[PDB]
Amino acid sequence: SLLVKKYCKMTTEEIIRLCNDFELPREVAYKIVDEYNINASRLVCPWQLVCGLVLNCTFIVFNERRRKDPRIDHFIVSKMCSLMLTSKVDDVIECVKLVKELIIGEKWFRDLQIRYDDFDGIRYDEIIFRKLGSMLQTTNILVTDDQYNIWKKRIE
Amino acid sequence: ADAQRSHYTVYPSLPHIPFVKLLSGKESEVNVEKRWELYHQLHSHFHDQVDHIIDNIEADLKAEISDLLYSRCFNTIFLLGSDSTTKIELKDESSRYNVLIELTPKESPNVRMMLRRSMYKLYSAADAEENDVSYDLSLVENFKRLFGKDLAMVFNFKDVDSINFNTLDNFIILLKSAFKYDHVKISLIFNINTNLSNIEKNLRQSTIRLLKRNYHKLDVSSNKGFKYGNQIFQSFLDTVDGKLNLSDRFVEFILSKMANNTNHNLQLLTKMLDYSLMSYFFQNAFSVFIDPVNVDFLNDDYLKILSRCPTFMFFVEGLIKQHLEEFFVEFLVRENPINGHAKFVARFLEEELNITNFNLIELYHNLLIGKLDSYLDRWSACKEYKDRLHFEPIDTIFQELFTLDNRSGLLTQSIFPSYKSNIEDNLLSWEQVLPSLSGDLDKIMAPVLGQLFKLYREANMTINIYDFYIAFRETLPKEEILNFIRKDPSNTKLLELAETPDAFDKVALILFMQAIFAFENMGLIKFQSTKSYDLVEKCVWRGI
Amino acid sequence: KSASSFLDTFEGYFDQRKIVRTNAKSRHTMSMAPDVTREEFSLVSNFFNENFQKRPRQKLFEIQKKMFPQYWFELTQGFSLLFYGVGSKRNFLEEFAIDYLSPKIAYSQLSIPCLILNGYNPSCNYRDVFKEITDLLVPAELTRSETKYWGNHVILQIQKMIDFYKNQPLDIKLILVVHNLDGPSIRKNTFQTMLSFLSVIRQIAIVASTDHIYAPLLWDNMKAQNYNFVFHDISNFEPSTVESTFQDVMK
Amino acid sequence: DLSIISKYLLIASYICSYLEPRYDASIFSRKTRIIQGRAAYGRRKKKEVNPRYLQPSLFAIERLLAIFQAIFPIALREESLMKANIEVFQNLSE
């Protein structure tokens, strides 16, 4: 497995087209590059951090498709196990939730969550009523009305 | 100023229902009135049965205390799980005064105070039942000469797990001296919430041998055989039946939260059930249709949000793959007999089989999830009724508007929040709490508490406060601070302090000292030395 | 910055208690810090406290005023409200309990007096506050048998109010506002016992705030029963210019 | 009769009183390190005197909560570690 591999001589171009493989724009790809090249001297396995940065940015950049179609959340993580040579699906979400510790307080990730409007998976207007303890919050039991209209057009 | 007082009364200058308009502000006021009234009938119907159950709890506990009390040594009663609120009453028996003397650890600083309060209570009761005396045990010696009657003393030691055990031991040895009087009998009641062995190893062995001559044990706690919880939840099932059904995740939430509380889990259960009912009648606009006479009050919004059900999804997908208002109003008559089946298997379970140590909430959870057979495959006495007591739940259509479910995370924010986790998450991910709308400064620089917390989280044992202030400066931008500090020409002191060449460091030190003492008030940071104020220690860590 | 491997959970707790060598400790004090007078500290502090991030705080306060009917509905059902969060919760509780809560309760029961406690003040006392509760609610005075033998008169009187008020009609006679329930004189055991037994009384509405991050350690199961809290997070990043005058900031 | 949180908090309190804080990271640490760094080595020697025979030591609240979270029994949105909520502090107060 590539997650087991230790002390990899990273060049820039390989993580450039690793970021370019997942439809990420140029700005967040350069921020992931600059985020790696500061912490690179103290990394046990750099693929842990690179996979965590790539996935934790692509659930924010492609969150609008993620809220509509759920199975892409089952899909794109499976595009890790095909190319990272890993048969374990718990290891890659472990990579996500262990880069989440190192990424949360930083300014560029802050600005990414502003500009794509994603705050632990939901919108700002959802989380301001989740934190306030509102009874009138949109409980996730109903199907979405946009999804209802999508299925109505699927019939049509 | 009122801000500098300790306490002050304000009468506000005045110039009717807390429920709001639902359906994006399109709900009629009559539906608001019906929601308020119908919530009040459900709430009153629940709490009437809750009140009768509570009075039954005190009545039965008083009955068993009176039974254990009246059928040359102490009569000792050890009440396990007491959490003492019982008002113990005694007999009105002729030729013998029965006096109940209650003692708390606050009333027990030493043996002398315990004896003095006991003799004062004894003389007060014996004067009220029918010259001054000394408040010592000789009043017990001369009781027949002053009142003509025998003495029966019952000592109620409230909260024995808080009393000093040497003082209690010496008071019991003091009370042993009254055994040489023929007119005196003494009962002791110990209210225990830890264990018997805990008090057994904090008393001397001679006192333990003294108490062993006549002692009884009795369990007091609210989880005694679950029968007082099992009533209250069934009372909720006697209130909501035919109206809403409980979700399985809500029931296992009840199970987990009641497993976390020892002394008071009945009132926690009542509080969670009440708050779920409040949340339902405050959030859903369909709660007017719980009353079966409001079925003519359907509008376009009601049918528009009615069609967005997973059950209605599956039903219309099945009917499309095979080959609205009248379909809705006729399907509101079914009774959902899971509550009646749960009550039936409960009365079957302690009717003849004599199985009484069950939780009805566990039974209802396993009946909801369809794993009832795995629940009653534990007792090994009800093997003959695996088809008599078998039930299959029926997933009805559009029941998700008429339900009590825990999926929005509202109960775990309002009743049991992750308090310190919420504090540190709002400190660290502040963009979440604050809107993202000093126009050029608010986009660039964080609030000072959040930036200071992000620099605080990434530090060691001891933080040097000067270097930490330098680390706080390097995050701030000088240029737009100097631009925004000159954006108010009315205050000239701010402009002349901005003209000074050391303006930025000074302003950063203002913000840093204000935010540091904010963290010191909140408890995140600590000065280890009373003087100097040159170093700090972190107190709290995120995610613990 | 820490040269750590972990930051969160016990992983960052155990990993950040390194035994730092004495050769790597900086001997930096406030001697080379900038010299700042009191008045310029006050001026810069009030300028950013009235101008920095003011529009998001105003907007966020405009969201969380929509929670006022839910707070009133929680208060009518017997729940005490405890508010918590990052920033000052003084103005929020004043506006909610004065502008909104008392006129709504007064009009629904057909104004309601509002005792306002300042727990940030270190000289807040239970006996003075309870003498004013006596002045506002006029409870019946304890008999000689009810005084026992050097008992606390405040606690016994409140218990007498408890078994008096159980049969009275359940209408709110007093709104009792506690700013900073975890401040220095207010966090002590007797004052918390007093407010717990007051919170048993349904006819008093309890609105309180806390500031310490370890504040729920104040309450055992009996006190948590008596309070009967519904918790609400109101984080707003306010100045807290009133409480800060009660601590010494120049030190 | 006593609660699971209060039992595990008593076990964590006993560990905090009768074990040294410096050897905590050699006993409870189990997380994979993204960042390079050696963990604690542990204690070289064995004590001559049983510490359980002597008086207990004094600890802080944050250490007790850390060891309680390390010893309490157990995907993308689960976070199976139990954080210090109202019930943990309430059980500590009892």
Swiss-Prot record, chain A:
Family according to the record: Belongs to the ORC6 family.
Protein encoded by which gene: ORC6
Role description: Component of the origin recognition complex (ORC) that binds origins of replication. It has a role in both chromosomal replication and mating type transcriptional silencing. Binds to the ARS consensus sequence (ACS) of origins of replication.
Domain of life: Eukaryota
Note: Present with 2970 molecules/cell in log phase SD medium.
Subunit structure: Component of the origin recognition complex (ORC) composed of at least ORC1, ORC2, ORC3, ORC4, ORC5 and ORC6. Interacts with ORC3, ORC5 and TAH11.
Compartments it resides in: Nucleus
Protein name: Origin recognition complex subunit 6
Origin species: Saccharomyces cerevisiae (strain ATCC 204508 / S288c)
UniProtKB/Swiss-Prot annotation, chain B:
Residues making up the signal peptide according to the UniProt record: none
Alphabetic keyword roster: Acetylation, DNA replication, DNA-binding, Nucleus
Residues in coiled coil: none
Keyword DNA-binding: yes
Subcellular location: Nucleus
Single GO cellular component term: nucleoplasm
Protein function: Component of the origin recognition complex (ORC) that binds origins of replication. It has a role in both chromosomal replication and mating type transcriptional silencing. Binds to the ARS consensus sequence (ACS) of origins of replication.
Quaternary state and interactors: Component of the origin recognition complex (ORC) composed of at least ORC1, ORC2, ORC3, ORC4, ORC5 and ORC6. Interacts with ORC6.
Name the record gives this protein: Origin recognition complex subunit 3
From Swiss-Prot, chain C:
Compartment(s) where it occurs, according to its Swiss-Prot or TrEMBL record: Nucleus
UniProt KW keywords: DNA replication, Nucleus, Phosphoprotein
Main location: nucleus
GO CC aspect terms: chromosome, telomeric region; DNA replication preinitiation complex; nuclear origin of replication recognition complex; nuclear pre-replicative complex; nucleoplasm; nucleus
One GO term (biological process): subtelomeric heterochromatin formation
Organism domain of life: Eukaryota
Gene Ontology MF annotations: chromatin binding; DNA replication origin binding
Subunit architecture: Component of the origin recognition complex (ORC) composed of at least ORC1, ORC2, ORC3, ORC4, ORC5 and ORC6. Interacts with MCM10 and TAH11.
The family this protein is said to belong to: Belongs to the ORC2 family.
Annotated function: Component of the origin recognition complex (ORC) that binds origins of replication. It has a role in both chromosomal replication and mating type transcriptional silencing. Binds to the ARS consensus sequence (ACS) of origins of replication.
Note: Present with 1700 molecules/cell in log phase SD medium.
Protein name: Origin recognition complex subunit 2
Native source organism of the sequence: Saccharomyces cerevisiae (strain ATCC 204508 / S288c)
Source species taxonomy: Eukaryota, Fungi, Dikarya, Ascomycota, Saccharomycotina
Shown segment, full-protein numbering: 234 to 497 of 620
Swiss-Prot record, chain D:
Subcellular location field: Nucleus
Protein origin, superkingdom: Eukaryota
Assigned protein family: Belongs to the ORC5 family.
Known function: Component of the origin recognition complex (ORC) that binds origins of replication. It has a role in both chromosomal replication and mating type transcriptional silencing. Binds to the ARS consensus sequence (ACS) of origins of replication. This subunit is a candidate for the mediation of ATP-dependent binding of ORC to origins. May also be a substrate targeting component of a cullin-RING-based E3 ubiquitin-protein ligase complex RTT101(MMS1-ORC5).
Note: Present with 768 molecules/cell in log phase SD medium.
Subunit details: Component of the origin recognition complex (ORC) composed of at least ORC1, ORC2, ORC3, ORC4, ORC5 and ORC6. Interacts with ORC6. Component of a cullin-RING ligase (CRL)-like complex composed of at least the cullin RTT101, a linker protein MMS1, and the potential substrate receptor ORC5. Interacts with RTT101 and MMS1.
Protein name: Origin recognition complex subunit 5
Positions spanned in the full protein: 323 to 426 of 479
